[PDB]
Structure 1
Amino acid sequence: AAPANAVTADDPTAIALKYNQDATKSERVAAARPGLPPEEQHCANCQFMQANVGEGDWKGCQLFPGKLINVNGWCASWTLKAG
């Protein structure tokens, strides 16, 4: 039920960043990105998610301009939402 501009698996940027729209099917453990335990890192708590784009579970992301991610996803550029 993904919108038309959703980030898709064939997107080059998704490949380089190891994006998935379900963070439990992601490589969050291997990267061991700092700031939280890798078992709690998803899109809803990332600094790069734009809550003012998209709707529902399909919000905007800065790294994916013109596209939408899922709030339950993850990629290797994960950074704690301090703001």
Structure 2
Amino acid sequence: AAPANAVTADDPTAIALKYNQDATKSERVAAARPGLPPEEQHCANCQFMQANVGEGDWKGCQLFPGKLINVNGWCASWTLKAG
């Protein structure tokens, strides 16, 4: 079950970025964002994931202030975690 502040499918920014909490139900292949082959991309290996926000599988994303994403999710702003 998602936290009360999870990013949800109806959030305008989530729609614009084609976020999904489950990267296997995402369009990461179509987007072909650079840095890793697409099938390898999810929030856990994204630069915008905030490992010190949230709990468990539900972590922060700098693009979704006040909310939580799933570490197993994806959106079209995915960017390799470089530091």
Give the TM-score band, short-chain normalised.
over 0.9
**Counterpart of 1:75?**
75
TM-score of the superposed pair, with normalisation by structure 1 = 0.99
Q: Where does structure 1 lack aligned partners over 5 or more consecutive residues? A: none
After the TM superposition, which segments of 4 or more aligned residues of structure 1 sit over 6 Å from their partners? none
TM-score of the superposed pair, with normalisation by structure 2 = 0.99
Give the share of equivalent positions with the same residue, in percent. Answer: 100
Q: Could you report, residue by residue, the CA deviation over 1:14-36 in whole angstroms, capped at 9, with x for unpaired residues?
A: 00000000000000000000000
Q: Could you report, residue by residue, the CA deviation over 1:31-61 in whole angstroms, capped at 9, with x for unpaired residues?
A: 0000000010000000000001000000001
Q: Where does structure 2 lack aligned partners over 5 or more consecutive residues? A: none
- 1:74 and 1:28 mapped to 2: Cα distance? 7
Aligned length in residues = 83
**Root mean square deviation, CA, Å:** 0.3
- 1:73 and 1:28 mapped to 2: Cα distance? 10
- Aligned with 1:30: secondary structure? helix
